[PDB]
Design a protein around this ligand. Structure first.
Ligand SMILES: [Zn+2]
Ligand SMILES: [Zn+2]
Lengths: 30, 21, 30, 30, 30, 21, 21, 21, 30, 21, 30, 21
């Protein structure tokens, strides 16, 4: 694939798309 | 972190896989 | 606030809004 | 909860989440 | 333009796009 | 109303315009 | 879980808060 | 307005309740 | 209607809303 | 292109129709 | 990556994320 | 087509790639 910019809710939307049923963690502070 | 490489810079869907459980 | 039905990516968007800088874990069943 | 930045459609998405069946008004001009 | 099915937050997004700076009222039934 | 019609049926962008300020 | 409850049923923002870090 | 305190600055979901009907 | 700014995924969301069943093409490079 | 008139500038839904098939 | 159900605008968002600068064609059936 | 398959069934990101320019 390619690389792109993902800010705010768009990043979590992408994580949902990529991880799906595996689940994921969104940790900005880290 | 995930942010430092996506909003300020750019990231790939491949890298996003790093945050799946 | 009110109750609501949140499916797919909509739940992730809701978690993002509710948690903010705190971050969150998205963990679907099996 | 916490505070965050909500621009454009993200703001209306948040209003929908918070208000739900109560409905809401989105008035930029005001 | 075309007709379409708009449920939940998707309707709010559509209203945002159609109304723009004019703003809008989101008023669901009872 | 429009919220119900758009979801249970279908609706046009022109019908949505009736709800702009 | 919460992912299933929110979609097959309904859920509150307060219940969602249990899943913040 | 709602914008002056969300996009340019920051706003809370609590404040958003002010715009519900 | 009016004019507005549509960036990234928001632009494709708008194209989907406007074109619907007619389909559309999203070509950034052009 | 579609971008040069939407993200950097502003575009109308009418203009978006130009990209439908 | 994982498989998933993508309806309406969600499919367009997925295409946007997968294709990036390459762009894409959204072509629904009849 | 892909638009129908992804919604009535399920689809992969790899199948979606066939529709990139
Ligand atoms: Zn955005
Ligand atoms: Zn949806």
């Amino acid at each position: 694939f390619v690389n792109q910019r993902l800010c705010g809710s768009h990043l979590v939307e992408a994580l949902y798309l990529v991880c799906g049923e595996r689940g994921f963690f969104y940790t900005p502070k880290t | 972190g995930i942010v430092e490489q996506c909003c300020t810079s750019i990231c790939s869907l491949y890298q996003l896989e790093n945050y799946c459980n």
